Each structure stands twice: as structure tokens, then as C-alpha cells.
Design a protein around this ligand. Structure first.
Ligand SMILES: *[C@@H]1O[C@H](CO)[C@@H](O[C@@H]2O[C@H](CO)[C@@H](O)[C@H](O)[C@H]2NC(C)=O)[C@H](O)[C@H]1NC(C)=O
Ligand SMILES: *[C@@H]1O[C@H](CO)[C@@H](O[C@@H]2O[C@H](CO)[C@@H](O)[C@H](O)[C@H]2NC(C)=O)[C@H](O)[C@H]1NC(C)=O
Ligand SMILES: *[C@@H]1O[C@H](CO)[C@@H](O[C@@H]2O[C@H](CO)[C@@H](O)[C@H](O)[C@H]2NC(C)=O)[C@H](O)[C@H]1NC(C)=O
Ligand SMILES: *[C@@H]1O[C@H](CO)[C@@H](O[C@@H]2O[C@H](CO)[C@@H](O)[C@H](O)[C@H]2NC(C)=O)[C@H](O)[C@H]1NC(C)=O
Ligand SMILES: *[C@@H]1O[C@H](CO)[C@@H](O)[C@H](O)[C@H]1NC(C)=O
Ligand SMILES: *[C@@H]1O[C@H](CO)[C@@H](O)[C@H](O)[C@H]1NC(C)=O
Ligand SMILES: *[C@@H]1O[C@H](CO)[C@@H](O)[C@H](O)[C@H]1NC(C)=O
Ligand SMILES: *[C@@H]1O[C@H](CO)[C@@H](O)[C@H](O)[C@H]1NC(C)=O
Ligand SMILES: *[C@@H]1O[C@H](CO)[C@@H](O)[C@H](O)[C@H]1NC(C)=O
Ligand SMILES: *[C@@H]1O[C@H](CO)[C@@H](O)[C@H](O)[C@H]1NC(C)=O
Ligand SMILES: *[C@@H]1O[C@H](CO)[C@@H](O)[C@H](O)[C@H]1NC(C)=O
Ligand SMILES: *[C@@H]1O[C@H](CO)[C@@H](O)[C@H](O)[C@H]1NC(C)=O
Lengths: 98, 46, 283, 320, 49, 49, 99
């Protein structure tokens, strides 16, 4: 019955795995390796070629940070509810129904 | 002529799991319980 | 373009040729040769959902088409559509028309049970008895009636002591990220290019640090509530009540009760929090 | 000879016909690739070559179209099946392949040469040498040659009770020719069908000729009567190849344990989109459907008078 | 646009997470009503009088 | 094509983020409603207002 | 590329040349010279945190290296792992290994 605690770990692991898998994205570039682009092409177009990858990876990082920020609020709500329940049930007797 | 415009661009709406009749039945059951029993049905048999 | 052409009633002006809508897309066109007005609309599409009881039990499945009539849009055409290889004609297995759409592969019975697999609009399906996939309408509960009267009452004589559990999450994993290595792995030129963006990484580090401190504060608020560390007396007789399954045992190296050990062993099926790992991971 | 026609049979392909897509080693990963593959549970031809009419030659070697690839396989016991000649038009005016297996040399030749009525090879060495060269008279233009070890390392049948299961996949793309193979013995042969087992086909050679191939032909290695020309019993299968999306499963060592198609049945692509071979009870969303167009319509106004382009360009005097 | 679908495949997984988030939102929407209303395991009936 | 693809992905991501943010407060309101239903209908509450 | 090359026990097949990992990283390579299977593992790194009691009171500070074992990366290494001149004294305090 410990699905609530398992879901947190599953979500965190899946999000981190997606973030580390995102590195394979081409983002419209010819290749996904910086060294190959540097070795095969001169700087004048290599600048924009690497700039596209920079934009893609920055967007992915921003999305991950936003997701973590959103999840933190739900975790905080659960923690506050747990603290209130501890204070009102363990340390005394509660007349509230259910 | 508004729902179809959104539907033609892959924007759908899924129906709820519980219809209105079941919610009405739950409300009627709660009303009958609280009328004929009081608060005893909330912690055991009515 | 690609779409279905039908007649239209939009009276174009002499100089107007095309037509648009609120959806910034073409919707009407005039034929280049004959002076006829036609409207453009895309041909039918939709979504597909698959219902399965699990590979560990059986390989039978049921297919649901969303938002389409069973006969108005018979995706059962000669062969070649999207997801072409499936045929799932299955006229033998009766097709049931639901509010959500057309359900192909399930049998509809005049019964009621609990909801095992939610489909939509009060229809649920389950793998029940030989063995096949069935669809029905979920049951709210068992009927009952209370004998109300002007002068009548019920008084209990017996009591039952009940113990129930409740699990609540408290905190999550604290993580930190490095911009330079993740974005530009081993490239000084890439880092120099990143330097032209200013500071898109102070915000991320600040947010993650705030989240970590918030997690620590949450744990402190939930658990740290008493100013003293009490001990129970060595004698464990409390009016006949037995607390041996929740009080800590000094014999074990870790002062944890039996139930706490069971909880840890149950949750350890997935433990991604490997803090013990270090730079020694070079095997 | 004046042999009679034989109606082709059919067999279920089962879960066979998978090869390593790339040279890269991958371990403990579930990699999904889009490439040419043999669909699971597909019809395969069952050409059977045997001593017909107890001494009559059977010419069961039609000019099968090459299309996009083949899945030639055999349950051969002794060295009787050889040769995988190709030809766009099968004459002296068209470049062609020739894969012989004489002794211990493939002798890959790419030459223009005339094709016999029923080309064949002599498994027994003509003593004294072997006119095994009866398949053609001469080759006037030769482009590519290649000699190496024979394509098969399978041990001879020896006492018997076990036969070879040579499998070959021929694919031609962007002026390249790739060959994959895998061999294994067979336990029971009562129904004479491909056993339900998984096999990985490793690359063996790369051939860079950009030859155009449209038809496929095979040869036989029969010496003489042991009346006319006769040999033993053999059987081979041909399976056409079509594009498909596959999900592969590597092991700790780095070998493909098993794979799953992504279009066979809804459970298959549900497993594909979940990136796992195990699916728990529930309802999942997999993909979408629509109706593809059936006709092409092109409507332009009808006018014919050409524009006066020559006047603008071929003018004696141009303005300032 | 068949070629646009091929071009979009080069952007990695930008559609799986969106679908997962929407499905999670829908499931939570169902769970909200299930928690709020389904509080009694019996269906009582009022007396005719 | 890449420019349009990036723009539309940005629009979709913004929409998803706003939907999640709204779902959070909807969940909070649903929890409050469930607590009120369990405390006021199924019993008598001494909490003022 | 940059990394620490060490002996490998990968069961490379004859046709296989380049190894990889779970996420598109080449953790193995085959020697163009005399055949030898080899690993690639990125060079050591980590984060840095500075501990201070307040500019108002004192100037002495303590430095914590995040997630690195003390033995292989002390401050006495002449390699100067970035921040070259930025060196805390070798034994300013008995170096403490924490989780
Ligand atoms: C309980 O009492 C009520 C009221 O006395 C009964 O309902 C009827 O009420 C009307 C209006 O007050 C009276 O004129 C009727 O005489 C009442 N009915 C009877 C049968 O007396 C109700 O019937 C009573 N129920 C029981 C079980 O005694
Ligand atoms: C009231 O109900 C309780 C229910 O547990 C009764 O306890 C049980 O009584 C029966 C009587 O035959 C015994 O067989 C059981 O062994 C009792 N339970 C246990 C756990 O021992 C109780 O006796 C009833 N009466 C009173 C006055 O409490
Ligand atoms: C309190 O409960 C524990 C439950 O473990 C009791 O310990 C068990 O006692 C029985 C007595 O027959 C033994 O057979 C078991 O092996 C014991 N279990 C363990 C884990 O040691 C304990 O006796 C109870 N104490 C009281 C006072 O009721
Ligand atoms: C993987 O390679 C190993 C080594 O060649 C194969 O052989 C056995 O592997 C197991 C480990 O799974 C060892 O315990 C045995 O000692 C190895 N040898 C023998 C004779 O069994 C193994 O079969 C290969 N496949 C798998 C799935 O491990
Ligand atoms: C095309 O040709 C037909 C027959 O010559 C003629 O009737 C029609 O008017 C033509 N189209 C236009 C736009 O004039
Ligand atoms: C109940 O079963 C009968 C067949 O016995 C069927 O005709 C009827 O439609 C079923 N009820 C409903 C509501 O479909
Ligand atoms: C061609 O077929 C005839 C049968 O009519 C056969 O006798 C002849 O031998 C074949 N050609 C060659 C070169 O064997
Ligand atoms: C070889 O013969 C073919 C077929 O007649 C011919 O097309 C080609 O030119 C010849 N090559 C020579 C004579 O070098
Ligand atoms: C096979 O035939 C070729 C034809 O020239 C010959 O060169 C080769 O030596 C033969 N292989 C043997 C004899 O093993
Ligand atoms: C050159 O490469 C070969 C390839 O294996 C190797 O055996 C040899 O030692 C290398 N060095 C020299 C000097 O040949
Ligand atoms: C902190 O600094 C302020 C101004 O620099 C000073 O007035 C104050 O006394 C300081 N605090 C202590 C404890 O010395
Ligand atoms: C640090 O390295 C030393 C020597 O390799 C080792 O003895 C020690 O256990 C390591 N510490 C940790 C925490 O791994």
C-alpha cells in the first residue's frame, strides 16, 4: 500500500532519466557532438551550429527546473498536513470527525 | 461552431468518469443517512 | 494540401479568391477554371486507446476508439490506414457503443461490479469468467434502508477496537546541477559562447538551493517537535497492553522497530538515493 | 528438361530474420531502430528441390524479383546449395553477380557473361578438370573480383542426424551490398518448418558495387546420376523484406536476447511505447489514426499564349 | 506535411512528457470527485413517509 | 521550419505549465471541500465560522 | 576527448568497434594500433562550497569539497585542479572526510 512514497521516487528518477536522455537531441544540427562540429567546420557557421544546441539544452534545463519547482509545492502541502496531523493526533485527542 | 474548430487542430475533451446521475445518487444517500440516522452512520452502522 | 472538398455558400467578391477563418488557415477556394466556390476540410482522424489486463495474466486486449461512432466512421476499411497492420474487425465480439466512443473487443453484460479499469462515463471493464474481457456499468454500492419511526432507537452493546494506518509524504530528493559540464562537455569555445548569454544559470542554482533548504525545513518541522529525549522504563508491562512490535530494540545495531524494518524493506525495492557513492565509481 | 510446374507452398516465418543494425557495441539497453526487417509471422515461399519422379530433373529455380531484400535460408545437410547469381535483365548486356563456392574460395566476380538455360554446379569433382564452368561460356567485361575464405564455416554432416541451418540476408542500398549469416543445428525435423527460436545475424562482408538488381536466381550443385542429372533432398525459403520499426533488447554481454515488433498487434506497440516487455493492468494511449488520400487533383487555368520573353531579352537597344 | 513529421523527430522527446502531464492531470481530476463524494459505502433510501 | 517548430513548442510548453499551476489550486480547493463535507455533514463542528 | 583510460573487460565481437553507454556516451574504444579494448571515463570533478562565520567577526574560512574522497584529491596536488592560486594550506586542519 506504500504507493504514495513510491510515486515520488519514480517521478524523480523518470525526470532525471529524461533530462539525461535529452542530450541525444539534434535540435536541427547536423550532429550531436560538439567536437565533430568543431573539427569539421570553420567557426563562421560553427557559431550558429552550436548556438542551436545551446538553445535546445537551455530550454530543457528550464523545463526541468520548472517541473521541480511545481512538485516542491505539493510536497510542502503534504508535509504541512503531516505536521498538523502529528500535532493534533499524537499529542492529544481530536474531536474532529474522520 | 466552436468545438469543431478546436477539434480540427487536435484539441479534444475527455468525458468525466462519473456522470451526473451517480453524483446525485451519492448526494441523496448522504441526505437520507443524515436525516434518518444523525452522525452515527459516519462511524459505523447506521 | 489534403482534405475533403464539398460545396459551399460563401459568396465571394469579384476580386476575392481565397478564404480564411478565425484559425488563420485556408477554408474556402474558388476553382481556377469554372466559377465555383469550394470549401476545404480535413478528412477524419482520432485517437486510439488499448485496454489490457496485464501480460502476467493474458495477452488478450480491447481497443477503444475515441470520439467516433461505430458506423459513421468505420475505420474498418480495406486495409491501409494509420496503424495499418491491425484489422480488429471482430464482428463476433460485439462492438459496444459508449459515450466516450466505440469499444471493439469487449462483451457488454447486464451486471454491476466495482470499477477495475476505468473507461469513461461510468463504464468499466475487467478480466472475469471461460475467461474473457467484459464491459459493464459500475455499481455505487449495496442498497440499504433504515427503519425510521416516530418512536424507535438502536443502542449498541458491544465494541470493537480498530487500528488503521496512514502514509503521508514529507520530503523528496535534493539535487544539484552543473551548467558548464551538461551544456558544453569539454569545450572551452562552447563555454566562451555561453559567456555571451550573461547569467541564465544563477537562477537555476538559486532555485535548487532554495528547494534543498525547503526540504530540510520540512523535515525539521514534521519531526523535531519535542525538547527532551524520553526513555521507557526497562519493565514493559502496561496494563496488559503489548507494545513490543513498535518500541525500539537495543539488540539491533540500528534502533528501529519491527514495523519500521518492514517499511524500509518494502520501500527499498527502488532506492535511487545512492549518497554513499563517490568518485570511486570507476569500475 | 521438360519438367512440369510445381505449385508453391507457404510457411509461417515466426520470429526470425533479425540482424545487428550497426557496428556499435551496446550493453543492457533497450534500443529501438528503424530499418529494413522481416515482419513476424509472415508467409514465406517453400521451394523444395529433390529428385523428381525418381530420376527426373526439377527446374524449381524461377527468376524471383529481388525487390528490396531476401531472407534466403536452408535446412541443408550436405554441400548441395550454392550460387546466388543476380541480374537486372539476365543477359550478356547487363552487369551481374556470381557467388560460387568452389572448394574453399568464394571467388566473387562482377562480369558481363551469358547465362545458361539451367545453370548448375558439380558437387563431385570431375576427376582427372570440373567443367563446373558450364553456367556460362565466357565473360568479356570484368569489373570487380574478390577471393577469400568460403562464406560457410559449417562442418560437414559427418555421420549424420544433424543438418545445417544457414541463413542469409541480402540488402542493397546506396551502392552497397551487405551479407549477414548465422548457423545452428536442428533437433527435430518431422514437420520441416523453421523452429521457433531467436537468432542474431552478424555481418560477414561489405560489397561496394552499385549494380542495379531486380531479379534473384539460385543454383544447385549436382554432379551427375549416381539417369540424367540427379541429387539428394534439399529445401530453401525466400522471404521479401519491407521497412518496419523494431525494438531490440541487448544483454549484459552485448547480444540480442529478443526483440518485439512495433506494428504487429496493439499489445506489441503498447510494449514499444512503454519501452518495456511487461505491461501492467490498465488503459494506455498509444497512437492516432486517420485516412490517407487516394487521388491527386491539379487544377490550373487553361491558357496557351506564350509570354513575349524574347522581346525583353532580344532587343537591339536597351534603355539607359 | 509528411516531411515536417520527419523533421520534428530530430527534436527528441518533446511529446511524451506533455502527454504524461495531461494524463496525470486528468487522473487527478477524476480522483478529486472520487475523494469528495464517494464517502459512504451504503446507498440509503428515505422512508416513503 | 525550425523557427516555427521552436515557436509552437514554446507555446505548448507555456500552456502545459499554466494548466499544471491551475490544477494545483483546484486540488487545494477540492481537499478543503472534502474536509468540510467530512466535518460538517457527518458530524457537528465546534470550530467558529 | 578527455578522460582516464583504463583496462576493460568488455566482450567485444570482432566486427564491433565503438562502445557506448545507456545515454549516448562512448565509454569504450578499440585501438587503431595493436588490438586492445579500452575504457573511457571522464576526469574527476565536483562542486565547491565556502563556509564563513561572518565578515563582521573574522576572516578565517573553511572550504568544503562536495562529493569527493579526500585521498585522491587533496589540496597539495601540484596539478592545480582549476582555481590555480586559490590554495588552502595543506594541513590547515586535519582534513575531515564526511558523507
Ligand atoms: C408519526 O406521527 C405522524 C404525525 O402524528 C403520523 O403522520 C400523520 O400525520 C397527520 C398530520 O399530523 C395525521 O393527521 C395522521 O393521523 C398521521 N398518521 C397517523 C397514522 O396517525 C405518522 O403516521 C406517525 N407514524 C407512525 C409510525 O406512528
Ligand atoms: C460484546 O462483543 C465482543 C466482541 O468481540 C464480545 O467479545 C467476544 O465474545 C464472544 C462470546 O462468545 C467470545 O467468544 C469472543 O472470544 C470474544 N472476543 C474476544 C476477542 O475474546 C463480548 O463478549 C461482547 N459482550 C460484552 C459484554 O462485551
Ligand atoms: C508481545 O508480542 C510479541 C510478538 O512478537 C510476543 O513475542 C512472541 O511471543 C510468542 C509466545 O508464544 C512467541 O511464540 C513468539 O516467537 C514471539 N515473537 C517474537 C518476535 O519474539 C510477546 O510474547 C508479547 N508479549 C506479551 C507480554 O504479550
Ligand atoms: C554471457 O557471457 C558469459 C561469459 O562468456 C557466458 O558464460 C557464463 O556466464 C555466467 C554469468 O551469467 C557465469 O556465471 C558462467 O560461469 C559463464 N560460463 C558458463 C560456462 O556458464 C554467459 O552464458 C553469457 N550469457 C549470459 C546471459 O550471461
Ligand atoms: C478551359 O477550356 C474549356 C474548353 O475549351 C472552356 O470552356 C473553359 O472556359 C476554359 N477555361 C477557362 C477558365 O476559360
Ligand atoms: C440485457 O440483456 C438482453 C439479452 O438477454 C439484451 O437484449 C439487453 O440489451 C441487455 N440490457 C441492456 C441495457 O443492454
Ligand atoms: C534448356 O532446356 C532444354 C529443355 O527443352 C534442355 O534440354 C536443355 O539442356 C536446356 N539447356 C541447357 C544448356 O542445358
Ligand atoms: C561486353 O559485352 C557487352 C554485351 O554485348 C557489351 O555491352 C560490352 O560493351 C562488352 N565489353 C567490351 C567488349 O569490352
Ligand atoms: C576456385 O576457382 C577459382 C577460379 O579461378 C580459382 O582461382 C580458385 O583457386 C578455386 N578455389 C580452390 C581451387 O580452392
Ligand atoms: C604496426 O601495426 C601492426 C598492426 O597490428 C602492429 O602489429 C605493429 O606492431 C605496428 N608497428 C610496427 C612497427 O609494425
Ligand atoms: C556588525 O557590523 C556593524 C557595522 O559594520 C557593527 O555596528 C556591529 O557592531 C557588528 N556586530 C558585531 C556583533 O560586532
Ligand atoms: C578514499 O580512498 C582511500 C584510498 O583509495 C580509501 O581507503 C577510502 O576508503 C576512500 N574513502 C571513501 C569514503 O571511499
Amino acid at each position: 500500500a506504500l504507493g504514495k512514497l513510491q510515486d515520488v521516487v519514480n517521478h524523480n528518477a523518470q525526470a532525471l532519466n529524461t533530462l539525461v536522455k535529452q542530450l541525444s537531441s539534434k535540435f536541427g544540427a547536423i550532429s550531436s557532438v560538439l567536437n565533430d562540429i568543431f573539427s569539421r567546420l570553420d567557426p563562421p557557421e560553427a557559431e550558429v551550429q552550436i548556438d542551436r544546441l545551446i538553445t535546445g539544452r537551455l530550454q530543457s534545463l528550464q523545463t526541468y527546473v520548472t517541473q521541480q519547482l511545481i512538485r516542491a509545492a505539493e510536497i510542502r502541502a503534504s508535509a504541512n498536513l503531516a505536521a498538523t496531523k502529528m500535532s493534533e493526533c499524537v499529542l492529544g485527542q481530536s474531536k474532529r470527525v474522520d | 461552431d466552436l468545438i469543431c474548430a478546436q477539434k480540427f487542430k487536435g484539441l479534444t475533451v475527455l468525458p468525466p468518469l462519473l456522470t451526473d446521475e451517480m453524483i446525485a445518487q451519492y448526494t441523496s444517500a448522504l441526505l437520507a443517512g443524515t436525516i434518518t440516522s444523525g452522525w452515527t452512520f459516519g462511524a459505523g452502522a447506521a | 494540401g489534403t482534405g475533403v472538398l464539398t460545396e459551399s455558400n460563401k459568396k465571394f467578391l469579384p476580386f476575392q479568391q481565397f478564404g480564411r477563418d478565425i484559425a488563420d488557415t485556408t477554408d474556402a477556394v474558388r476553382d481556377p477554371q469554372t466559377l465555383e466556390i469550394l470549401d476545404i476540410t480535413p478528412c477524419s482522424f482520432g485517437g486510439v486507446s488499448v485496454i489490457t489486463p496485464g501480460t502476467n495474466t493474458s495477452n488478450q486486449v480491447a481497443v477503444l476508439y475515441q470520439g467516433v461512432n461505430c458506423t459513421e466512421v468505420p475505420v474498418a476499411i480495406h486495409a491501409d490506414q494509420l496503424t495499418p497492420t491491425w484489422r480488429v474487425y471482430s464482428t463476433g465480439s460485439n462492438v459496444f457503443q459508449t459515450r466516450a466512443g466505440c469499444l471493439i473487443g469487449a462483451e457488454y453484460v447486464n451486471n454491476s461490479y466495482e470499477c477495475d479499469i476505468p473507461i469513461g462515463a461510468g463504464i468499466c471493464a475487467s478480466y472475469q469468467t471461460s475467461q474473457s474481457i467484459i464491459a459493464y456499468t459500475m455499481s455505487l454500492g449495496a442498497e440499504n434502508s433504515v427503519a425510521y419511526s416516530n418512536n424507535s432507537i438502536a443502542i449498541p452493546t458491544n465494541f470493537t477496537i480498530s487500528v488503521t494506518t496512514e502514509i503521508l509524504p514529507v520530503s523528496m530528493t535534493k539535487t544539484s546541477v552543473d551548467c558548464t559540464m551538461y551544456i558544453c562537455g569539454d569545450s572551452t569555445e562552447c563555454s566562451n559562447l555561453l559567456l555571451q548569454y550573461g547569467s541564465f544559470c544563477t537562477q537555476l542554482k538559486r532555485a535548487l538551493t532554495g528547494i534543498a533548504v525547503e526540504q530540510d525545513k520540512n523535515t525539521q518541522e514534521v519531526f523535531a517537535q519535542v525538547k527532551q529525549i524520553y526513555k521507557t522504563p526497562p519493565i514493559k508491562y502496561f496494563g496488559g497492553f503489548n507494545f513490543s512490535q513498535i518500541l525500539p530494540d537495543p539488540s539491533k545495531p540500528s534502533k528501529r522497530s519491527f514495523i519500521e524494518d518492514l517499511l524500509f524493506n518494502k520501500v527499498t525495492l527502488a532506492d535511487a538515493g545512492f549518497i554513499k557513492q563517490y568518485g570511486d565509481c570507476l569500475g | 528438361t521438360t519438367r512440369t510446374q510445381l505449385p508453391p507452398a507457404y510457411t509461417n516465418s515466426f520470429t526470425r530474420g533479425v540482424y545487428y543494425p550497426d557496428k556499435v557495441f551496446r550493453s543492457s539497453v533497450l534500443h529501438s531502430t528503424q530499418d529494413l526487417f522481416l515482419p513476424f509471422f509472415s508467409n514465406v515461399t517453400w521451394f523444395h528441390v529433390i529428385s523428381g519422379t525418381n530420376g527426373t530433373k526439377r527446374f524449381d529455380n524461377p527468376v524471383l524479383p529481388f525487390n528490396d531484400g531476401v531472407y534466403f535460408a536452408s535446412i541443408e545437410k550436405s554441400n548441395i546449395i550454392r550460387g546466388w547469381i543476380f541480374g537486372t535483365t539476365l543477359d550478356s548486356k547487363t552487369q551481374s553477380l556470381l557467388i560460387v563456392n568452389n572448394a574453399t574460395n568464394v571467388v566473387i566476380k562482377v562480369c558481363e557473361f551469358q547465362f545458361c538455360n539451367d545453370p548448375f554446379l558439380d558437387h563431385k569433382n570431375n576427376k582427372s578438370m570440373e567443367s563446373e564452368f558450364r553456367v556460362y561460356s565466357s565473360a568479356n567485361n570484368c569489373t570487380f573480383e574478390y577471393v577469400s575464405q568460403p562464406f560457410l564455416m559449417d562442418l560437414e554432416g559427418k555421420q549424420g542426424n544433424f543438418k545445417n541451418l544457414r541463413e542469409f540476408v541480402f540488402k542493397n542500398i546506396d551502392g552497397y551490398f551487405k551479407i549477414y549469416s548465422k548457423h545452428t543445428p536442428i533437433i527435430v525435423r518431422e514437420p520441416e518448418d523453421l523452429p521457433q527460436g531467436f537468432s542474431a545475424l552478424e555481418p560477414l562482408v561489405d560489397l561496394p558495387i552499385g549494380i542495379n538488381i531486380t531479379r534473384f536466381q539460385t543454383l544447385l550443385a549436382l554432379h551427375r546420376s549416381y539417369s540424367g542429372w540427379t541429387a539428394g533432398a534439399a529445401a530453401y525459403y525466400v522471404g521479401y523484406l519491407q521497412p518496419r520499426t523494431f525494438l531490440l533488447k541487448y544483454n549484459e554481454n552485448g547480444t540480442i536476447t529478443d526483440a518485439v515488433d512495433c506494428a504487429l498487434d496493439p499489445l506489441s506497440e503498447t510494449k514499444c511505447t512503454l519501452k518495456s516487455f511487461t505491461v501492467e493492468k490498465g488503459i494506455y494511449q498509444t497512437s492516432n489514426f486517420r485516412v490517407q488520400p487516394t487521388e491527386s487533383i491539379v487544377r490550373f487555368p487553361n491558357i496557351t499564349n506564350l509570354c513575349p520573353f524574347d522581346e525583353v531579352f532580344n532587343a537591339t537597344r536597351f534603355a539607359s
